[model samples]
Target: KVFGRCELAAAMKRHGLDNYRGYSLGNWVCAAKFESNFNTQATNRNTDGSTDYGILQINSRWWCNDGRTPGSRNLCNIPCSALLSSDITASVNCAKKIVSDGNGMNAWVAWRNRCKGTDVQAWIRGCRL
Candidate 1:
């Protein structure tokens, strides 16, 4: 599903992304905004044969097993397809693992490029939790 900005913010917060692991709601929103543009089914293929799935674009190399990415770890223990759901429960949960895996939001290059050290108050502005 393609989520509106506020809808995504509410969903992310409800899924426990707000202030999660010292990252604010806007940081998550900022990652989503650039990664998938809030589209749940978004997927990206890396040059190393890994694929990124869902709104957060969780990677296949270590997070999920797509049966294609070489040496996939499947640490999240869910199918890459699971992250495509609009519900975002699995997506959010897996993302938490991705963040906690020693990298925090730096797990995503989009987050690094767009959201790092950037105040994204406007990303979640004009919305109520």
Candidate 2:
């Protein structure tokens, strides 16, 4: 399902993303804009053949097992399809594991290229948080 900007922001917060690993909700909002455009079903296969799944774009290389990405650690021990669900619980939980594993929000290149070191307040502006 596709989520509106504020709606996605609230959902991320409810899933404990707000200020998770020193990254604010706005950073998440900004990354989501570029990562999956708030679409839970978004998926992209990387150039190396690893795929990214879901709203947060969790990677198959080190997180979820896609049964195709070779040598994948599958640290989350979940199928990549779980990340594509509209519920977003598994995606969020996997993201938290990514952070705790020391990648932080930098686990997503979208955040580095788009959200990092930028004042992302506009991403969440006017949202009733």
Candidate 3:
């Protein structure tokens, strides 16, 4: 399912992830924008050949299993398809775990490459938190 920016922002805030895990709401919103554009079922193939899953683009390498990717730790103990669901509770929980693992939002290459250190406020512009 595709979500509007305001809807996504409100959801993220409701989930308590807007500024959780040491990252700002802007960072989270911007990262999601760059990662999956708020598409719940979004997926992408990385240069390393690992597939990214869901809105936050969690990787199959360490977070979840896509079945095709081998050697996954499955740290979240969830199927990668779980992240593709319309309900993002699972995805948010898994992302919390990922951030706690010390990588922070840097875990997402999209965040590091595009959303990092920039004016990310626009991601949540006009959204009431």
Off by over 4 Å in 3: none
Which candidate number has the best TM-score? Answer: 1
TM-score (all chains, Cα) for each model: 0.97, 0.94, 0.93
lDDT of 1 by residue, 1-129 (tens): 999999999999998899999999999999999999999999999999999999999999998989998777999999999999989999999999889889888888999999898888779999998
TM-score, candidate 2, is: 0.94
lDDT of 2 by residue, 3-109 (tens): 99999999999999999888888988998889999999999988999999999899999999899988887999899999999898898888888878776777788
- For 1-129, candidate 3 gives per-residue lDDT tens digits of 998898888888889897797788888889888889899999998777678889999988888988877666788999999999999898999999998887788888889999888999878889877
Steric clashes per prediction: 0, 0, 0
Which residue pairs come into collision in candidate 3?
A: none
Stretches of candidate 1 exceeding 4 Å from the true structure: none
Q: Give all candidate RMSDs, comma-separated.
A: 0.8, 1.1, 1.3
List per-prediction Cα lDDT, in the order shown: 0.92, 0.90, 0.87
Off by over 4 Å in 2: none
Shift of residue 63 alpha carbon in model 1, Å? 0.5
